[PDB]
Ligand binder design. Structure first.
Ligand SMILES: *[C@@H]1O[C@H](CO)[C@@H](O[C@@H]2O[C@H](CO)[C@@H](O)[C@H](O)[C@H]2NC(C)=O)[C@H](O)[C@H]1NC(C)=O
Ligand code: NAG
Ligand code: NAG
Lengths: 122, 205
C-alpha cells in the first residue's frame, strides 16, 4: 500500500502563481506513475498533469498548457505542481494520484491510489 | 454438508505486499468463504504489473470470488472489467463487518466503474463502517436501497453521488421490479429485490 498527502494549496490572487506538493508514504520503493487531478463544484473530476516514474515523460491537459509544470524527487518521494498564471476557472480541489508501473495516464480509471485532496481557490 | 474456509485478505499474510487482487494471488482465493481482512480491486489488476512480474487479470478469474460470503474488513472495488454490468463475483456476499475500514471510514467502497447495477443481492449486513458509492456513470438502483436495513450502528452513513442521475435511471426503465418492496433493489430482476411485497419461495419473490 501507499498513502499520498497533498500540500501547498490555499487561496491565490487572480493571476498569481502557486506550487502544490504531494508526499508519498508506505511501500514507496517501486515503480509509480504520478498524476494530478482536480474537481470543480458541480463538475466531474478531470485530468490536470502526470509524470512517469523515471521523470522523462510528462503530460498536461489542454486547459493548463504552458502554465503548469510537474516534477518529482523520488529520493524525497514527492511530486510537485507549479501553477503559474492562475485563473478562477482553475478553482477546484486538487488530488494527487498514483498508478503502479512506470507510465502516467490521462484518465482517472488507471490510478490505484488517491490523496484526500487540497482546495485551491482563485 | 457445508464447507467453510477462511483466507487472509490483501495486505495480510501471503498477500502482505500485494496492492490488489491479481492474476497470481486470485488462485489462492479458491474455496474461500470468509475473508479475514480486506479486499482491494485496483486498476493494476487488469492492467498487469511488470515490476512484480504479474500478468494482467483475466475477468473470468473473478468467478473464484463467488464462494465468499463474508468479509471481516472492507470491500474496495476501484476497477472492474468494462464488459461486465454488475458485481456478479460478489453475488453471494452476505456480510461485511467493517472491523477495518478504508481511510478508517468506509467498509464498502464502489468507485469509478462502468457497471449498470450493484448485484449484491445476498448482502444483508454491514456491521460497521460507512458506504461510499461514487463516480459510476452508468450505475442505477443504488439510490433505492434502504441502507438502515443493512447497517449495524446508528452512526453509519452513506456517500452515494456522481453516478447515473435518477432522472436517466427512471427514464431508461432502470428501476426496481414491481414485485420489489419499497426497500429498494440491487438491480432490475425480482431476485434483486431487497425484500418482497407479497411472497417469496426463496431468493425470487
Ligand atoms: C500480485 O500478487 C502476487 C502474489 O501475492 C504478488 O507477488 C509478491 O510480490 C511481493 C512484492 O513484490 C514479493 O515479495 C513476493 O515474493 C511475491 N510473491 C509471489 C508469489 O510472486 C504481487 O506483488 C502482486 N502484484 C500486485 C501489483 O499487487
Ligand atoms: C478447492 O477445493 C477442491 C476440492 O473440491 C480442491 O481440489 C482445490 O485444490 C481447492 N482449491 C485450493 C486453492 O486449494
Ligand atoms: C469506463 O468508461 C470510461 C468512459 O466514461 C472509460 O474512460 C474507462 O476506461 C472505462 N473503464 C474501463 C475499466 O475501461
Amino acid at each position: 500500500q501507499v498513502k499520498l498527502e497533498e500540500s501547498g494549496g490555499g487561496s491565490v490572487q487572480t493571476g498569481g502563481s502557486l506550487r502544490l506538493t504531494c508526499a508519498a508514504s508506505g511501500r514507496t520503493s517501486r515503480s509509480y506513475g504520478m498524476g494530478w487531478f482536480r474537481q470543480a463544484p458541480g463538475k466531474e473530476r478531470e485530468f490536470v498533469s502526470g509524470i512517469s516514474w523515471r521523470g522523462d515523460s510528462t503530460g498536461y491537459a489542454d486547459s493548463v498548457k504552458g502554465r503548469f509544470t510537474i516534477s518529482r524527487d523520488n529520493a524525497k518521494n514527492t511530486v510537485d505542481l507549479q501553477m503559474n498564471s492562475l485563473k478562477p476557472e482553475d478553482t477546484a480541489i486538487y488530488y494527487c494520484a498514483a498508478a503502479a508501473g512506470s507510465a502516467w495516464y490521462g484518465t482517472l480509471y488507471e490510478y490505484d491510489y488517491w490523496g484526500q485532496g487540497t482546495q485551491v481557490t482563485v | 454438508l457445508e464447507e467453510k474456509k477462511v483466507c487472509n485478505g490483501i495486505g495480510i499474510g501471503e498477500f502482505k505486499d500485494s496492492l490488489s487482487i491479481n492474476a497470481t494471488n486470485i488462485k489462492h482465493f479458491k474455496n474461500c468463504t470468509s475473508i479475514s481482512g480486506d479486499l482491494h480491486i485496483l486498476p493494476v489488476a487488469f492492467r498487469g504489473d511488470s515490476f512484480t512480474h504479474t500478468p494482467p487479470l483475466d475477468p473470468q478469474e473473478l468467478d473464484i470470488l463467488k464462494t465468499v460470503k463474508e468479509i471481516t474488513g472492507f470491500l474496495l472495488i476501484q476497477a472492474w472489467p468494462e464488459n461486465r454490468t454488475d458485481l456478479h463475483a460478489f453475488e453471494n456476499l452476505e456480510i461485511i463487518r467493517g472491523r477495518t475500514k478504508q481511510h478508517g471510514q468506509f467498509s464498502l467502497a464502489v468507485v469509478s466503474l462502468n457497471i449498470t447495477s450493484l448485484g449484491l443481492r445476498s448482502l444483508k449486513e454491514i456491521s460497521d463502517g460507512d458506504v461510499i458509492i461514487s463516480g459510476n456513470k452508468n450505475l442505477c438502483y443504488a439510490n433505492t436501497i434502504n441502507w438502515k436495513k443493512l447497517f449495524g450502528t446508528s452512526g453509519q452513513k452513506t456517500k452515494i453521488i456522481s453516478n447515473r442521475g435518477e432522472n436517466s435511471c427512471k427514464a431508461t426503465g432502470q428501476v426496481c421490479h414491481a414485485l420489489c418492496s419499497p426497500e429498494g433493489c440491487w438491480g432490475p430482476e425480482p431476485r434483486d429485490c431487497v425484500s418482497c411485497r407479497n411472497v417469496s419461495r426463496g431468493r425470487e419473490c
